Paper text:
Thus, to stabilize a double translocated complex, we mutated the second sense codon to a UAG stop codon.The supplementation of the reaction with a mutated and catalytically inactive version of the release factor 1 (eRF1*, AGQ mutation) causes a +20 nt toe-print signal from the first sense codon (leucine CUU codon) in the P site, which is in a good agreement with previous report, indicating proper binding of eRF1* (lane 5). The most populated class of particles represent a double translocated CrPV-IRES with aminoacyl-tRNA in a canonical configuration in the P site and eRF1* in the A site. Both aminoacyl-tRNA and eRF1* populate conformations recently described, with the characteristic bent of the mRNA at the stop codon. The small subunit in this reconstruction is in a non-rotated configuration and the 40S head is not tilted or swiveled. Given the conformation of the P site tRNA is completely compatible with that of a translating ribosome, we believe the addition of eRF1* in the present sample does not significantly affect the conformation of the CrPV-IRES. CrPV-IRES has undergone a conformational change that mainly affects PKI, but also the relative orientation of PKII and PKIII. Once eEF2 leaves, the back-swiveling movement of the 40S head triggers a dramatic conformational change in the CrPV-IRES: PKI is disassembled resulting in the ASL-like segment relocating to mimic the acceptor stem of a canonical E site tRNA. The mRNA-like element of the disassembled PKI remains in the E site of the 40S. These conformational changes in the PKI of the CrPV-IRES upon back swiveling are combined with a reconfiguration of the relative positioning of PKII and PKIII.
Type IV IRES sequences, including the Cricket Paralysis Virus IRES (CrPV-IRES) and the Taura Syndrome Virus IRES (TSV-IRES) do not require initiation factors and are the best studied IRESs. A modular architecture of three pseudoknots (PKI, PKII and PKIII) is crucial for these IRESs to establish a balance between structural flexibility and rigidity, essential for interaction with the ribosome and with two elongation factors (eEF2 and eEF1A) required for IRES translocation through the ribosome. Type IV IRESs require two translocation events to place the first aminoacyl-tRNA in the P site making use of the intrinsic dynamic elements of the ribosome involved in canonical translocation. We report the visualization by means of single-particle electron cryo-microscopy (cryoEM) of two related states of the mammalian ribosome with a double translocated CrPV-IRES and P site aminoacyl-tRNA at 3.2 and 4.75 Ångstroms resolution.
Author numbering:
A (entry chain XX): 2 to 130
B (entry chain bb): 2 to 102
C (entry chain n): 1 to 25
D (entry chain BB): 2 to 218
E (entry chain WW): 1 to 83
F (entry chain SS): 2 to 133
G (entry chain DD): 58 to 278
H (entry chain YY): 2 to 72
RNA sequence: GGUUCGAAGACGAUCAGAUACCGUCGUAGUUCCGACCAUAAACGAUGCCGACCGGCGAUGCGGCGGCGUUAUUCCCAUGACCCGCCGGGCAGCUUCCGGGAAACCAAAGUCUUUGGGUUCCGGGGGGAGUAUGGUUGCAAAGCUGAAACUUAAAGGAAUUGA
């Protein structure tokens, strides 16, 4: 059974980048995955996309720019600290020049560069470099 | 170490198959694994298709063929040279030898 | 020594001992 | 290539493609070529599209106009169908043909004295002319190929759809290209119908020389 | 490719595929460069200029070499629209 | 086991190729035509060469010899390369067209051709041959 | 004592024209000559031998021995080789592995751990390189660390230019051939790892066959 | 790791213990049989009354009588 | 209940010796109805449920669309032959998707670019599936199951030879 959605979708786009489609349809859709998607299309690692409201759950048709080596997820969503985020990034993004770790805070789903400005830890969702 | 893909026998929907007695030996062999042949043969082959036709009764006659179905175990096959060993790609050719004459 | 004919041999010199250790009861 | 009724397909180029039998394709089909196919017959023959013949006859003849030296063009047929279609072609654009038997390690090998180094490969059939193209890897070689619905597309950079096995069909596609490159340079007019005849580029069978030398008287 | 002071430090900018956005490596031979000629709109002759492109080694033997030049051609007005 | 080494046939095709005129069928005469011009340091080797010559000179009288060109049938080879017919094979009036090839050309501007003898495909769509 | 260049790109070089083999690298054109590389880098280039290995092939009367020269090279500034050759004596084997390396040189990238003020000093991201069953990995690292690794893939990098770097490893390292092959390939994978400093598009220039086309019709066939 | 849950923590931890008893340089460690056998009992040196001098042969390729004692 | 075959046995040949092959007989057994026993290379030597990533030629079951022969003659639709469309099934072929130690695998793929959920299990060779105790059976045996001692190699896939 489809026990956990995100990670259906996140491999899918990666597996449509290795191969290289002009765009990718990803099946049952949520308010965490569309959310995640907008965080990516806020730093340019994909382009603009369309969601398709069929009265069930949506489908989404992203358009994939070839600036995307790999997307991935972490599972389960561990509980992080402000003292314990160096030693993810320092073992989960490739370089000290690029990379991003999406997590979920009370003040929103966002990237690790911003949760150090708002000074808020919380959970963890996946990464993208 | 693996050499054949389909391991000596045609069987992919079954688990168990029925056994058959090698007609040179009398060994049990799995139906599918066997080497089979079919023989059709007039009771006159080449030499004796001459003596009978001039000292026979009926004006325009035809003699009967003789129909057998053989079944070989692997080493019964190989000894009697119905079949060879073969090289590694060569192996593959399920394309049977050409019967023109 | 083939395997199967060794596992007769463990199986024959254990069944003797089950005669032996019986008698001493 | 198009939009321009100065490069467009002419009334005088419809009854040559039909009369030879270049539109008449195959029964089998590779997955790449369904964007040059109209619709199948009740009989079992794939009709190849004719607008997409002209829009892909000029793009290829747009690269050969962009090529700087006449020499560098390596034209080929192994097969004996159109070897008078790759030599007279060389007697109009000034290419370098290699017809009949490719000596492998031609492009790839230095020490030999058959040693080639072109900048474009115009080959009459990818399937048959296999050994040409893999060499088109080890050195970098923008490739052209007169493909069909049948063949696979290994080391080619343009797919011109036509029946490329027949006697009337291979040599007719080796005159237009030479026409439509020479017209794109200004050596034959778009005005005067081109003095050369299309039968100059079909290869001669040894069965119709016994027809032609022996029946003249 | 700088420090703070804006001076270009890295020793050469490589090529990038006009089709997919994958950088064309140095020991990658099944690469390509292909110029395509332009033609005067009234004369039907060579203008003296082209429309260049490129394709990398990973895309050719994969199979999709003859449906990337037409997705780049069409869009620069070499080839007509309906096709 | 009379078969001749590559020393022979190398020096035979290289003596037929140039001097096809002087040479001929006689063994006893080209025995001199092989010796006047060339350098050949043995009388046995002289005879092997000068008679395959005669073996090879009777094969120009029937078909084209592979490892060797000559000026007589190399012009007449190219005779057929410079052939052009009088009435062309493609420029034909009464051309055949099917009811799918009629409907695909008419989608383009060529939609009322005066010389298309429009035909039909044979009814029944069986073509394939059975298996076994 | 002459250099008599056969090819079309080598005859150009021999005339002092196509300036700085970064120009050939751009165009991905395959080098199969020795002197090109000798002509651009030359005395800036330093070789070594890391291992000579013997091998045999059982025949009917004893067996045939031979020797196997893996040879390092590459200027103290951004390019390296790692060729190999096998022959029936050793200084044959050495000589003809030097040459076969110079053939396949490749130009290395390098970058900054953290902050940017001075010069570039390590593998710009986390890249991995393999051959056989040895998996080397090259992790970026802060100033004056040094090269933290084993003798083999230290004696490539040191030269390469990469000055400070943390490594990893896997597998049968004793199979030297592989290791030394496994870390080279790795550094071959610095200039093929796409960052957002290189998302700005390509603007095309001209191959050396196209610009030099009237000169080459007059100088060699 | 193979049983990835968030509240597994014991399933995970009953399995490695179980396991580590398969480890040798450890079980040899975590049972009393290693120190029951051992002459020194658990120790780096231990003194004794000699009683006869004795030559032991060596094993093959090598050969040469080796000079020992029995304490 | 006992036709054929056929462990044990009796002879005949064989060989230096054969209590092994072959050859002549023949019990337990081979077959039914009743209840025990729980293991086999019980095999694809390949966990089950889930997503995704190429091309073709067959085939079985079900549904749908479409020229034309044939059957019941009188055609309605049902059967038989003919070309596709969709769903689930057993297999193939092709290939620079990718992997691997290779053989090879469209899975054995999507793994230092290391996290979809979960169950069994291995940690150099022998000793040894042994001893012992507990367990289950009428019995043979089945499930659980150590130690002292013993040793630098067992082993895998591929090369050339002989």
């Amino acid at each position: 059974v489809r026990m956990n959605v995100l990670a259906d979708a996140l491999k899918s786009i990666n597996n449509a980048e290795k191969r290289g489609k002009r765009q990718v349809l990803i099946r049952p859709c949520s308010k965490v995955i569309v959310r995640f998607l907008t965080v990516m299309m806020k730093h340019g690692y994909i382009g603009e996309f369309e969601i398709i409201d069929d009265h069930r759950a949506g489908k989404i048709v992203v358009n994939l720019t070839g600036r995307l080596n790999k997307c991935g997820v972490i599972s389960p969503r561990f509980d992080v600290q402000l003292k314990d985020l160096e030693k993810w990034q320092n073992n989960l993004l490739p370089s000290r020049q690029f990379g991003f770790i999406v997590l979920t805070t009370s003040a929103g789903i966002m990237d690790h560069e911003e949760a150090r400005r708002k000074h808020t830890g919380g959970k963890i969702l996946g990464f993208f470099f | 170490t693996k050499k054949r893909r389909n391991n000596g026998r045609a069987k992919k929907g079954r688990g168990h198959v029925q056994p058959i007695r090698c007609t040179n030996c009398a060994r049990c062999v799995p139906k599918d694994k066997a080497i089979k042949k079919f023989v059709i043969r007039n009771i006159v082959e080449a030499a004796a298709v001459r003596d009978i036709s001039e000292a026979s009764v009926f004006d325009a006659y035809v003699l009967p063929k003789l129909y057998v179905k053989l079944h070989y175990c692997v080493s019964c096959a190989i000894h009697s040279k119905v079949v060879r060993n073969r090289s590694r790609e060569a192996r593959k050719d399920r394309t049977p030898p050409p019967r023109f004459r | 020594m083939r395997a199967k004919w060794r596992k007769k041999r463990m199986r024959r010199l254990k069944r003797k001992r089950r005669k032996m250790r019986q008698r001493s009861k | 290539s198009g939009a321009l009724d100065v490069l467009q397909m002419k009334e005088e180029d419809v009854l040559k493609f039909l009369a030879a039998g270049t539109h008449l394709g195959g029964t089998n089909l590779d997955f790449q070529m369904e964007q040059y196919i109209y619709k199948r017959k009740s009989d079992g023959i794939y009709i190849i599209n004719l607008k997409r013949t002209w829009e892909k006859l000029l793009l290829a003849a747009r690269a050969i106009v962009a090529i700087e030296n006449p020499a560098d063009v390596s034209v080929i047929s192994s097969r004996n169908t159109g070897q008078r279609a790759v030599l007279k072609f060389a007697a109009a654009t000034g290419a370098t043909p290699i017809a009949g038997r490719f000596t492998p390690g031609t492009f790839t090998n230095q020490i030999q004295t058959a040693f080639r180094e072109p900048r474009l490969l115009v080959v009459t059939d990818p399937r048959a002319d296999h050994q040409p193209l893999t060499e088109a890897s080890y050195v970098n070689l923008p490739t052209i190929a007169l493909c069909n619905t049948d063949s696979p597309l290994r080391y080619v950079d343009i797919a011109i759809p036509c029946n490329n096995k027949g006697a009337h069909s291979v040599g007719l596609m080796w005159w237009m290209l030479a026409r439509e490159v020479l017209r794109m340079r200004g050596t034959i007019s778009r005005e005067h119908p081109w003095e050369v005849m299309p039968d100059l580029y079909f290869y001669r069978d040894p069965e119709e020389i016994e027809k032609e030398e022996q029946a003249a008287a | 490719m700088q420090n703070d002071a804006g001076e270009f430090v890295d020793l050469y900018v490589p090529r990038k595929c006009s089709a997919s956005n994958r950088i064309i490596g140095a020991k990658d031979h099944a690469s390509i460069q292909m110029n395509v000629a332009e033609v005067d709109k009234v004369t039907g002759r060579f203008n003296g200029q082209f429309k260049t492109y490129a394709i990398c080694g990973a895309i050719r033997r994969m199979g999709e070499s003859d449906d990337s030049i037409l997705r780049l051609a069409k869009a620069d007005g070499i080839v007509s629209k309906n096709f | 086991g009379r078969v001749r080494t590559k020393t022979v046939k190398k020096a035979a095709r290289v003596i037929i190729e140039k001097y096809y005129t002087r040479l001929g069928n006689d063994f006893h005469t080209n025995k001199r035509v092989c010796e006047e011009i060339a350098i050949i340091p043995s009388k046995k080797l002289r005879n092997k060469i000068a008679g395959y010559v005669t073996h090879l000179m009777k094969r120009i009288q029937r078909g084209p010899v592979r490892g060797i060109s000559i000026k007589l049938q190399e012009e007449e080879r190219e005779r057929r390369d410079n052939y052009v017919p009088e009435v062309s094979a493609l420029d034909q009036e009464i051309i055949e067209v099917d009811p799918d090839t009629k409907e695909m050309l008419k989608l383009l501007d060529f939609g009322s051709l005066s010389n298309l003898q429009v035909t039909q495909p044979t009814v029944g769509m069986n073509f394939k041959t059975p298996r076994g | 004592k002459e250099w008599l260049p056969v090819t079309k790109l080598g005859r150009l070089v021999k005339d002092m024209k196509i300036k700085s083999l970064e120009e050939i690298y751009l165009f991905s054109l395959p080098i199969k000559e020795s002197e090109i590389i000798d002509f651009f880098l030359g005395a800036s280039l330093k070789d070594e031998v890391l291992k000579i290995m013997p091998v045999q092939k059982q025949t009917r009367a004893g067996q045939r021995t031979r020797f196997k020269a893996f040879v390092a090279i590459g200027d103290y500034n951004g390019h390296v080789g790692l060729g190999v050759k096998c022959s029936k004596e050793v200084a044959t084997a050495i000589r003809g592995a030097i040459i076969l390396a110079k053939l396949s040189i490749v130009p290395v990238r390098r970058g900054y751990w953290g902050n940017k003020i001075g010069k570039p000093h390590t593998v710009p991201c986390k890249v991995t390189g393999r051959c056989g069953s040895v998996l080397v990995r090259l992790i970026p690292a802060p100033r004056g660390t040094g090269i933290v690794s084993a003798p083999v893939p230290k004696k490539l990098l040191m030269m390469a230019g990469i000055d400070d770097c943390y490594t990893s490893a896997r597998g049968c390292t004793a199979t030297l051939g592989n290791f030394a092959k496994a870390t080279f390939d790795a550094i071959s994978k610095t200039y093929s790892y796409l960052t957002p400093d290189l998302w700005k598009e390509t603007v095309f220039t001209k191959s050396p066959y196209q610009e030099f086309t009237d000169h080459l019709v007059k100088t060699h066939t | 790791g193979k049983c990835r849950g968030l509240r597994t923590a014991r399933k995970l931890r009953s399995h490695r213990r179980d396991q580590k008893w398969h480890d040798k340089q450890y079980k040899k460690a975590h049972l009393g049989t290693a120190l029951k056998a051992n002459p020194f009992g658990g120790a780096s040196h231990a003194k004794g009354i000699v009683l006869e001098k004795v030559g032991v042969e060596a094993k093959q390729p090598n050969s040469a009588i080796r000079k020992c004692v029995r304490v």
